[PDB]
Amino acid sequence: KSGFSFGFKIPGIFELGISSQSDRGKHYIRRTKRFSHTKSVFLHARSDL
Amino acid sequence: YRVLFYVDSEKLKQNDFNSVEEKKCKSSGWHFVVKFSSHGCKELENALK
Numbered sequence A: 001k002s003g004f005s006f007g008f009k010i011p012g013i014f015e016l017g018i019s020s021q022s023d024r025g026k027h028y029i030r031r032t033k034r035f036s037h038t039k040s041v042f043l044h045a046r047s048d049l
Numbered sequence B: 001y002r003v004l005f006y007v008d009s010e011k012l013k014q015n016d017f018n019s020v021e022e023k024k025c026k027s028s029g030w031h032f033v034v035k036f037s038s039h040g041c042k043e044l045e046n047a048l049k
């Protein structure tokens, strides 16, 4: 934010005035989420009778 | 009558958590010959899991 004002007067008256206002706002958000789960097996039952 | 058993159980669990937060605020004001105003704000947030 920025602001400037100026005032100067001299009677011979005379009047002069400055008034300024500046406002700026920025917001940024980001999210990345990952979830992975893996399972893999076997069961090789072999029987000889 | 022979038997032959084998069990090999394994369990692993790992968890990591990290959080970062940063905030900055600045303001300046000067009034004499001319009025002046300045404002500054900064915010940062970071989290990892």
Ligand SMILES: *[C@@H]1O[C@H](CO)[C@@H](O[C@@H]2O[C@H](CO)[C@@H](O[C@@H]3O[C@H](CO)[C@@H](O)[C@H](O)[C@@H]3O)[C@H](O)[C@H]2NC(C)=O)[C@H](O)[C@H]1NC(C)=O
Pocket: A030, A031, A032, A033, B047
């Ligand atoms: C940054 O971190 C915050 C804080 O951990 C995260 O906020 C979380 O947002 C979820 C979204 O709904 C909230 O609900 C939760 O949802 C999950 C499914 O994703 C569910 O399993 C939970 O039971 C719950 O309902 C959660 O409550 C909230 N955390 C807290 C502590 O309130 C945010 O999501 C993170 N940023 C990103 C981009 O993920």
